[PDB]
Amino acid sequence: KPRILPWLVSQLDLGQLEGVAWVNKSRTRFRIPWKHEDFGIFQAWAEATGAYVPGRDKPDLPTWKRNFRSAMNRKEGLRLAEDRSKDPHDPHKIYEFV
Ligand SMILES: [Cl-]
Ligand SMILES: [Cl-]
Ligand SMILES: [Cl-]
């Protein structure tokens, strides 16, 4: 395989992942809960890309967060708009389509 952009836009349109959401009406900007049992977008992406199969691999979140940051930062039309990942209340990042 899947490509990060179409897969991401789909996850966001569906709105089934807690805290993972469009933040503007035009749907060029979105939130990922991010903190420096999750079952969130990092593991979902690992499963979609075959990097994680339950019971085959041991759970590795820091790696999932790394693989996922890597796939996102490489996309030319994706900018990191905001880094709130150290916030105590709701740690998150905002990404934008440029
Ligand atoms: Cl749509
Ligand atoms: Cl998951
Ligand atoms: Cl605050």
Ligand SMILES: [Cl-]
């Ligand atoms: Cl905040």
Ligand code: NA
């Ligand atoms: Na949400």
Ligand code: NA
């Ligand atoms: Na996760």
Ligand SMILES: [Zn+2]
């Ligand atoms: Zn859409």
Ligand SMILES: [Zn+2]
């Ligand atoms: Zn899963």
Ligand SMILES: [Zn+2]
């Ligand atoms: Zn924010």
Ligand SMILES: [Zn+2]
């Ligand atoms: Zn705060």
